[PDB]
Amino acid sequence: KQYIISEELISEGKWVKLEKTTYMDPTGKTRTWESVKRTTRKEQTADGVAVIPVLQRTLHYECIVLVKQFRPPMGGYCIEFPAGLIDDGETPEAAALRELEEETGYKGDIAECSPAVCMDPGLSNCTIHIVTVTINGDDAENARPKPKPGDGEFVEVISLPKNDLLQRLDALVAEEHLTVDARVYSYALALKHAN
Amino acid sequence: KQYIISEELISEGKWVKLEKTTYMDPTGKTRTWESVKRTTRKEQTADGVAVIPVLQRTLHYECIVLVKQFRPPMGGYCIEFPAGLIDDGETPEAAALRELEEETGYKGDIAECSPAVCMDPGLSNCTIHIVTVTINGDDAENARPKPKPGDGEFVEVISLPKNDLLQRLDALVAEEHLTVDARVYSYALALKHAN
Ligand SMILES: Nc1ncnc2c1ncn2[C@@H]1O[C@H](COP(=O)(O)OP(=O)(O)OC[C@H]2O[C@H](O)[C@H](O)[C@@H]2O)[C@@H](O)[C@H]1O
Ligand SMILES: Nc1ncnc2c1ncn2[C@@H]1O[C@H](COP(=O)(O)OP(=O)(O)OC[C@H]2O[C@H](O)[C@H](O)[C@@H]2O)[C@@H](O)[C@H]1O
Ligand SMILES: [Mg+2]
Numbered sequence A, B: 001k002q003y004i005i006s007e008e009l010i011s012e013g014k015w016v017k018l019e020k021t022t023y024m025d026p027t028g029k030t031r032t033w034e035s036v037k038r039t040t041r042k043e044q045t046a047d048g049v050a051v052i053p054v055l056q057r058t059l060h061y062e063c064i065v066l067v068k069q070f071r072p073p074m075g076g077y078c079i080e081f082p083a084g085l086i087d088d089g090e091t092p093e094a095a096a097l098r099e100l101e102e103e104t105g106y107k108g109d110i111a112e113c114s115p116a117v118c119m120d121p122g123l124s125n126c127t128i129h130i131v132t133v134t135i136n137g138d139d140a141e142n143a144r145p146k147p148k149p150g151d152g153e154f155v156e157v158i159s160l161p162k163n164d165l166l167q168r169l170d171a172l173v174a175e176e177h178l179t180v181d182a183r184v185y186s187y188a189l190a191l192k193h194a195n
């Protein structure tokens, strides 16, 4: 019953724009909202993908591969699932394997993919596909993985035991000022709440 | 290694603002970034809280209480954990219990509270505390929950089986084309991966 009436551009940069949204509520009344949008968004599937990479090795606990990097908006370092924007004509799964191999050097296999999900719905229209990727750590292909980083990209690879993820994330946070991503934390929490 | 050099306000609304961030990368080179920030953030406190409401009943497996509402930035409806911005001086735990009761009518008990985690670090400095709350669904008091939304709030309550959360979320996305929150989905995936 609710829908968008109009979007008034407020300010637009090279990557992000801010606009005043006018919409109709359930009572037929008009209301406004301040919304954010990436200017690099196409009429594709989503702004990007986030990869949940599960490193598997026989006789070993599984490991979750994460990345640490400085995030200007946060003014500090953050612990996140590897992620990146998608390419035209590229499938979410294709981008996931590509982003994973580029940031971590690992070559994985698609386990499953999510529909487009929202990053922060009360603020922006940003969406991503969360792609679960398993990595055969016993394959020579993944013996010594080498990441292909671009210019201006300084990412650190951190692998943590999946069987104790939440506590291991807490331990990392106890060593220095670090912010764990909400999707990573939600994931770690569910692993404990499940069983 | 890396650090903020300055933050220049580009545009500012009543709720959201856009800034130009200048920072130094590892090589010593000055780079820039377009960052988003909420104008309502109190000092020394995350922007808000997301509540993971665990409905517990003697004759049933646990349920996760979620809410569905129209999100202007998304131009459509979203399925999320109950959430709200934190009032000044209000504890994350109190904001969570209050928000859950207001949006769903359930009175819960604190189980745990996470440190501040980021929503979308590549875009904004927004953070929240993920607060796990248990609800005694057999208490007469929770027999027929009645919410009490504030100014212009139209939120719908949707409780789903924790044991089959992922599948149940996919159905809703296909049946009504709406969008699931990335944290809700990340949580659902781990529940599945653990089981
Ligand atoms: N707001 C911005 N300001 C300046 N440059 C930007 C911005 N957004 C994107 N860019 C440029 O595009 C590049 C995209 O790099 P990716 O690795 O593909 O994307 P990433 O920054 O990791 O974002 C992927 C996801 O994570 C974050 O939560 C982000 O909001 C997105 O949802 C950035 O490194 C940068 O050069
Ligand atoms: N960007 C905005 N534009 C217009 N009004 C806003 C905005 N942000 C907040 N408000 C006003 O403040 C109110 C805050 O309501 P809450 O329930 O306390 O917060 P909510 O909007 O649910 O946000 C909490 C969290 O959940 C979402 O992921 C959102 O992005 C945020 O991180 C909104 O209903 C609205 O009136
Ligand atoms: Mg990246």
Ligand SMILES: [Mg+2]
Pocket (backbone or CB within 6 Å): B082, B083, B084
């Ligand atoms: Mg809310």
